[PDB]
Amino acid sequence: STIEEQAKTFLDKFNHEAEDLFYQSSLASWNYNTNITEENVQNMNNAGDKWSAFLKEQSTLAQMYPLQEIQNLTVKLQLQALQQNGSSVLSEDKSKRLNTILNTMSTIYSTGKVCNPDNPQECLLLEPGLNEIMANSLDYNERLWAWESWRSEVGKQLRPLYEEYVVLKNEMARANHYEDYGDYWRGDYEVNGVDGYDYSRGQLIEDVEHTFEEIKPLYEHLHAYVRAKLMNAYPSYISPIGCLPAHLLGDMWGRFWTNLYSLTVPFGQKPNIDVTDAMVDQAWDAQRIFKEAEKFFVSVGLPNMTQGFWENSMLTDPGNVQKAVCHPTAWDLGKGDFRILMCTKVTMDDFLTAHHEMGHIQYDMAYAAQPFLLRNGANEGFHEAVGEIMSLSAATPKHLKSIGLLSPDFQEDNETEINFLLKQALTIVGTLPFTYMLEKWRWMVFKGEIPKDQWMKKWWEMKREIVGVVEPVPHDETYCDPASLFHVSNDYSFIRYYTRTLYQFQFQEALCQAAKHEGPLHKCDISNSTEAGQKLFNMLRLGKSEPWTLALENVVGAKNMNVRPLLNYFEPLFTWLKDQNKNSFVGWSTDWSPYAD
Amino acid sequence: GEVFNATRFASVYAWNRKRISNSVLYNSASFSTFKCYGVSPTKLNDLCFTNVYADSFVIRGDEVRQIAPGQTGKIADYNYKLPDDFTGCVIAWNSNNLDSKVGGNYNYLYRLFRKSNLKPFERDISTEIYQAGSTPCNGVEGFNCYFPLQSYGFYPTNGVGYQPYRVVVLSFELLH
Ligand SMILES: *[C@@H]1O[C@H](CO)[C@@H](O)[C@H](O)[C@H]1NC(C)=O
Ligand SMILES: [Cl-]
Ligand SMILES: [Zn+2]
């Protein structure tokens, strides 16, 4: 009789029907991704459209049960996930237009090219033409052209669309009783109605801003050390007190300084810890890799992979007759089916990646006994955080010694340790001010704190102050540079990349703590530690059925994000950087620019 | 040999009884479950009984746990219930090789909703629409009106907990 009992019944019907349709879509999507044919792609679209239509219909029926009259929270959660209105609450005219913008912006980024001035027939797309230049060119002017011509040709197209995109999204969020579309985005961390686990939407701002303050020292000393090393590669163009030219950072945006290792490697003449040679010399294959990965998770008390995995997963390239999609994926088809799609090759990067993707299966398996709507990470950051720590332990020479890929006569000198630690920081801590600043911009744009006639100004004002990066060419409001990045033009939240990183190292400290690890946090291997496995398992089993605060607290013992584990991981590099910067300015000035002279 | 080797079994909600009365069964070792609740298997073959009934059906791997006295859930409350004083044996084995096809075998069904729980050894095959709301259904599906039976989808790639299992339940009169 009660609405909660009715909702209980509706979800009971959903969960059984949804599990089947999803498994149908999963099977078809699998066939395409393993054998790209016109037949299998037509099945993938039909199965998807069926699953989608079902999902839309259920969402409309789900709203007929008001969650204002439901007390069971694991039911109120499931209903909340179904009756997400989205752009349904907007007028049918505006909704039609908003989708036209979204599909237009996506296709400008993906199907937009710029031809070089020297040869008007050889035109280049962002992928692979422009990204190859930004990731391999050492010429200041070649880099400058690609960086500028992308932001001027493609970016200016996206400017009038992103202005319309901001207005319509904000109407969609105010109609959904949010304050702005950025507040809507911060809902993915909200928790309400649980004593001591509530997490407001505005809280995510305070935490990110205060937790970033404690990264500022390490970043400055990294940034100082990179601007130093970059002055050797690009001599005349960089000032030892000014920001870094945006087109010199290894990719199109400076999101990752990963590509700068070749120029910034501290001790270049020492080799990298690469057991790729040692594996091939023992005639390893993809089978042996995933066995060792399976063996790793069993060592902490997690189950070994189901026989379905070993029989159905794609673990090699299936010849040259049929083409797959080797982008490493970990499938959770449902109905107890778990698979990893990977064209594995005998290297170290794949050995690591295997441990990463199997960790995704481990998470997928542990909450498979949850209701269908609650089979997911505790929040957007949890899933990749789990997959990453499985590569941390597996990479250490401690672990490589355990399995026989490294001789017990190994020299772990402080130099290769810092070489590796620097490589890490370029990717991990390099992207942290980038990711923060990009989202903070959008957060003030959606809130109206940045007028349209100051978008590009306030953009570079913050790129200077926060990231320490400066434009090589001045940009008025005809430009739209943030829209030149995938995640912005394609309407995706970006703060997930900041939290995912901090979470990752929170897990790794708490696990290495339970694993009685002695030395620094960066040499830890949680293998053979059942106390760590259990401590991790008590979070994986939860899925998204409980607040992310509690799920985090099941691993680390605290109910909130923290950064000091990240700093602790990099603290040996922090000191080395502090010492090499005695003959260089630490920090930057927001006034020097290459164009003003 | 024709209640165990039958090339198709009955749906759990419409379970089939067939009177077996007319050790080598238990020494097969190919049975995944052989849980008796009256006397040990090696014994009953030399014990006094008048009536032996075999109730046979197919269910999910995870649901085999429910074919036992005192159990609760969808299969126990709504499909096939065993009494607390059950005297007999429960046999189950994996049937994925037979009851799951590449396209997906949707033939086997089960009862998902019912107004009340089945009494021991009761059977219900009614297809009358379940009414979850105050307003009556009058024999049409819709909002708060669900067709009570639902279909098992068995694929050869399904997980073990989702694979089909053939179940045979032996019931003994146990004269005294
Ligand atoms: C919500 O309903 C589920 C139904 O299985 C039940 O297990 C759970 O205890 C309920 N939560 C409550 C009553 O807080
Ligand atoms: Cl059935
Ligand atoms: Zn991943």
mmCIF file with all atom_site columns, C-alpha atoms and ligand atoms in Angstrom, chain A residues 328 330 356-357 360 383-384 387-388, ligand 3:
data_model
loop_
_atom_site.group_PDB
_atom_site.id
_atom_site.type_symbol
_atom_site.label_atom_id
_atom_site.label_alt_id
_atom_site.label_comp_id
_atom_site.label_asym_id
_atom_site.label_entity_id
_atom_site.label_seq_id
_atom_site.pdbx_PDB_ins_code
_atom_site.Cartn_x
_atom_site.Cartn_y
_atom_site.Cartn_z
_atom_site.occupancy
_atom_site.B_iso_or_equiv
_atom_site.pdbx_formal_charge
_atom_site.auth_seq_id
_atom_site.auth_comp_id
_atom_site.auth_asym_id
_atom_site.auth_atom_id
_atom_site.pdbx_PDB_model_num
ATOM   1  C  CA . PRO A 1 328 ? 42.513 -1.396 -22.201 1.00 0.00 ? 328 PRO A CA 1
ATOM   2  C  CA . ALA A 1 330 ? 37.608 -4.070 -18.020 1.00 0.00 ? 330 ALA A CA 1
ATOM   3  C  CA . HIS A 1 356 ? 45.497 -1.947 -13.202 1.00 0.00 ? 356 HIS A CA 1
ATOM   4  C  CA . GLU A 1 357 ? 42.620 -3.376 -15.244 1.00 0.00 ? 357 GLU A CA 1
ATOM   5  C  CA . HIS A 1 360 ? 38.859 -2.785 -11.994 1.00 0.00 ? 360 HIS A CA 1
ATOM   6  C  CA . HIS A 1 383 ? 37.300 3.397  -9.452  1.00 0.00 ? 383 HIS A CA 1
ATOM   7  C  CA . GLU A 1 384 ? 40.476 4.666  -11.138 1.00 0.00 ? 384 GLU A CA 1
ATOM   8  C  CA . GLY A 1 387 ? 43.093 0.503  -10.445 1.00 0.00 ? 387 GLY A CA 1
ATOM   9  C  CA . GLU A 1 388 ? 46.137 2.735  -10.002 1.00 0.00 ? 388 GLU A CA 1
HETATM 10 ZN ZN . ZN  C 2 .   ? 41.321 2.135  -15.597 1.00 0.00 ? 3   ZN  C ZN 1
#
